[PDB]
Amino acid sequence: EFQDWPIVRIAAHLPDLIVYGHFSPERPFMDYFDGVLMFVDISGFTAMTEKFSSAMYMDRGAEQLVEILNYHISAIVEKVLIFGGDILKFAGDALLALWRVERKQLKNIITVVIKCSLEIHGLFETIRVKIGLAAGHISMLVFGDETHSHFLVIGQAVDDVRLAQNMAQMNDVILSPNCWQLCDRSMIEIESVPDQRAVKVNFLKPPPNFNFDEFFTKCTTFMHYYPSGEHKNLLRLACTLKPDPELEMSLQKYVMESILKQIDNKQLQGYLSELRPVTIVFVNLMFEDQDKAEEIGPAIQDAYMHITSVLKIFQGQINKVFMFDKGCSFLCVFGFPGEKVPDELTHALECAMDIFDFCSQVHKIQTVSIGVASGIVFCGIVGHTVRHEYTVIGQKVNLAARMMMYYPGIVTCDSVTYNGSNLPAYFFKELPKKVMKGVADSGPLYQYWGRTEK
Ligand SMILES: CN(C)CCOC(=O)c1c(Cc2ccccc2)c(-c2cc(Cl)nc(N)n2)nn1C
Numbered sequence: 001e002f003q004d005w006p007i008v009r010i011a012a013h014l015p016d017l018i019v020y021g022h023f024s025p026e027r028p029f030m031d032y033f034d035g036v037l038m039f040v041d042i043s044g045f046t047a048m049t050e051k052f053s054s055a056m057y058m059d060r061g062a063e064q065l066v067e068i069l070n071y072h073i074s075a076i077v078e079k080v081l082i083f084g085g086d087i088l089k090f091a092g093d094a095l096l097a098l099w100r101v102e103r104k105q106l107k108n109i110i111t112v113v114i115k116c117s118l119e120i121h122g123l124f125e126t127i128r129v130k131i132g133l134a135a136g137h138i139s140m141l142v143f144g145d146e147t148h149s150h151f152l153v154i155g156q157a158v159d160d161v162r163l164a165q166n167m168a169q170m171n172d173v174i175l176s177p178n179c180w181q182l183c184d185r186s187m188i189e190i191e192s193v194p195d196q197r198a199v200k201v202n203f204l205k206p207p208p209n210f211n212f213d214e215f216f217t218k219c220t221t222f223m224h225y226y227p228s229g230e231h232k233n234l235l236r237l238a239c240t241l242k243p244d245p246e247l248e249m250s251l252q253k254y255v256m257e258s259i260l261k262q263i264d265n266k267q268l269q270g271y272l273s274e275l276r277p278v279t280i281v282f283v284n285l286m287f288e289d290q291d292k293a294e295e296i297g298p299a300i301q302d303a304y305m306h307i308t309s310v311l312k313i314f315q316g317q318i319n320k321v322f323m324f325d326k327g328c329s330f331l332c333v334f335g336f337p338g339e340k341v342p343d344e345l346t347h348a349l350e351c352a353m354d355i356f357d358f359c360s361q362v363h364k365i366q367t368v369s370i371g372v373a374s375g376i377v378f379c380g381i382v383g384h385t386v387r388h389e390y391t392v393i394g395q396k397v398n399l400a401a402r403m404m405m406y407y408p409g410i411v412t413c414d415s416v417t418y419n420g421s422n423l424p425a426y427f428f429k430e431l432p433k434k435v436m437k438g439v440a441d442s443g444p445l446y447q448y449w450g451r452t453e454k
Pocket of ligand 1: 039088089090091092093094095096151152153154158159161162163165321322323324401
């Protein structure tokens with residue numbers, strides 16, 4: 001069986017949630033289901049990024065970093081896939097995976113996912129990982145325009161895996177409160193986590209008669225897309241997709257144009273692994289605690305329509321979209337493949353301010369915050385051959401992310417963006433520098449005030 005079609009190469013960049021969805025063209029589009037989520041924090045392994053920028057790597061730092069990082073992440077991805085998971089998205093610091101099932105099967109799948117999580121830690125018993133698990137209701141949001149599409153999962157099961165991850169330490173498996181409540185406590189030995197109703201898994205000791213492989217095989221019964229039969233030894237059913245112009249047209253909207261060029265063998269397959277000077281514009285849109293996914297969807301859609309319009313003008317791109325802690329964040333990048341300018345900084349700031357001004361007027365968005373940072377970041381396709389994504393990794397990515405969270409409601413920028421801007425100083429305001437999560441000394445940070453006092 002030949003399987004190297006463009007449609008298959010595109011499907012590699014997407015989860016089954018998208019590849020085998022059959023939903024409408026209306027945007028936003030929303031859907032609701034239940035499942036188990038797994039969040040694998042892979043920092044410590046992506047904190048090395050600074051080492052590989054050193055002159056010791058003789059201008060092959062990016063290539064060496066992508067190689068060693070994919071060595072490890074692809075092993076994590078194989079475990080997830082073999083246990084029936086769907087990897088939803090990659091980021092420099094983590095990956096999120098989903099086991100979507102009927103509510104009545106959540107109990108058994110949690111055991112599958114816990115076994116998976118511990119086999120993942122088993123891969124690193126000679127850097128390590130941190131794993132959070134959650135279970136419950138999940139809402140999916142698809143937004144975009146006629147040429148591009150983005151998706152998110154939303155809900156407290158998503159927020160649950162957020163906090164479960166934040167509590168974890170190296171080699172931990174933390175289960176959200178609702179996951180612990182729905183899990184098979186007959187099999188899962190836990191321990192308290194102080195002043196937190198979430199729990200840490202110590203052992204998975206099953207009944208004497210329990211045979212996991214038979215148990216897993218029965219669980220695959222409810223996994224709609226687990227490879228089986230003649231395809232039992234494929235990691236993804238996506239690998240079997242055949243040409244379908246209508247499906248490919250839909251799928252390619254989720255994929256960055258430069259990726260598609262490479263997919264089409266119109267660009268060298270290594271062109272996108274690089275250490276590149278870029279400007280990160282990290283946009284956060286916050287909604288109120290009580291806001292529900294059917295009201296958030298339209299707000300994100302309206303914000304997105306304007307965001308993409310401004311980025312096209314100032315020649316930026318959306319690398320990633322996330323949502324947790326009731327905030328939807330856009331990881332935007334300027335100076336990405338091909339399109340780099342020496343006025344990129346003023347454009348990034350002006351684009352930020354434009355996005356700040358519009359989005360603050362979108363209703364149901366309570367707060368807009370944008371962090372801007374410029375510097376060298378690693379760019380590359382990260383993951384497994386059969387499931388990977390273009391991602392950016394580096395100090396300035398994390399800095400932009402921290403700035404938008406620690407300085408809400410304004411546009412902030414780093415000392416690099418400030419000095420290099422083709423703009424005068426009174427356009428800015430030096431900020432009180434706060435102590436931020438896992439951040440080296442910033443340098444001075446600034447608020448982009450804009451051209452007016454008003
Ligand atoms: C700031 N970033 C550098 C780190 C952010 O955390 C991620 O790395 C990250 C996230 C966000 C997230 C969501 C819930 C719990 C923890 C983290 C997602 C993600 C994917 C999808 Cl489909 N839907 C939503 N809502 N989120 N995927 N990844 C890889």
